[PDB]
Structure 1
Amino acid sequence: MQVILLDKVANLGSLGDQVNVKAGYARNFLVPQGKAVPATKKNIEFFEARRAELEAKLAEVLAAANARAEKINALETVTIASKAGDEGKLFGSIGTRDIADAVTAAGVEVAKSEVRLPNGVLRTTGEHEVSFQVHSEVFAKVIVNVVAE
């Protein structure tokens, strides 16, 4: 009794997994409760289409991820106007909010959430490397500077 899963019934697998299973299981329980559907030509193709459509969504998102990445990765250095550090010590902290606004004016929009200030909170003045977690895994890299106000 081949049947296509609609959820993660017990150990049978997850949504979209044709598996051989004893008739009774689906003939009177899985199907009348809607937890799965019989593995038939029409249904299987539609689910396989749904499978490939979510694959295309995964492709498209990760494709646009490298887009943002390159947009700002290659150089694209930005600097912000922070109260003159005066012989050093900056007069303030450069937070995720402020750094996001800077890159956003440059064009490459970034939300502070995504920003990840490595090994510090941008306390000094002058040049300081930065990074951005553009995607769920893809890592970027940008140089940011500071000058007078």
Structure 2
Amino acid sequence: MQVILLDKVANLGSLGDQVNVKAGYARNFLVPQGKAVPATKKNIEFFEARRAELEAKLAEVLAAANARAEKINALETVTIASKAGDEGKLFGSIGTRDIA
């Protein structure tokens, strides 16, 4: 019985390693004690959907995380009016409440 392991079984595999297990081992232990589920070539894509979909929603964010750091060195100059007077003391007005 070809099963996909939902967890680490000691002498078999690791969170997905399709192995050929005796049917009694799977029928009576690995499936009811949820260490595995049979390899129907739908569960090789349905709970290896955790291998497929949860991996497939990472390649476009890997590409979308490149167009976010593209608008970085664009503006780089702001009208800053709080002068560093006699050696730089903060008293002015630049950030986080209200300009009208």
TM-score by length of 2: 0.61
The answer to whether the Cα contact below 8 Å between 1:85 and 1:91 also exists between their aligned partners in 2 is: no
Conservation of the 8 A alpha-carbon contact between 1:6 and 1:35: yes
Task: Tell whether the 8 Å contact from 2:8 to 2:15 is kept in structure 1 after alignment.
Answer: yes
Query: Partners in 1 of 2:98 and 2:20 — Cα distance?
Result: 57
In structure 1, runs of 5+ residues without a counterpart are 100-149
Q: Give yes or no for contact 2:30–2:36 (8 Å, CA) kept in 1.
A: yes
| Cα drift, residue 9 of structure 1 | 3.0
| CA RMSD after TM alignment | 4.4
Q: Is the 8 A contact 2:5 2:17 kept in 1?
A: yes
Deviates more, 1:41-50 or 1:31-40: 41-50
Contact 1:84 1:91 (8 Å CA) reproduced: no
Work out the percentage of aligned pairs sharing the same amino acid.
100
Q: Per the alignment, do residues 78 and 57 of structure 1 end up closer, same or farther by CA in structure 2, a change over 3 Å counting?
A: farther
Residues 23-71 of structure 1: CA distance to partner in whole angstroms, max 9, x if unpaired? 4432211101222101113322323444221222111221221121112
Over 3 Å counting, the alpha-carbon distance change for 1:79 and 1:39 in structure 2 is farther
Give 5+ residue unaligned stretches, structure 2.
none
Find the aligned partners of 1:77 and 1:11 in 2 and give their Cα distance: 62
Q: Taking structure 1 as reference, are residues 11 and 97 closer, same or farther at Cα in structure 2, changes over 3 Å only?
A: farther
- For residues 30 and 52 of structure 2, what CA distance do their matches in structure 1 show? 25
Could you state the TM-score of these two structures normalised by the residue count of structure 1?
A: 0.45
Query: Residues of 2 paired with 1:15 and 1:75: CA distance?
Result: 48
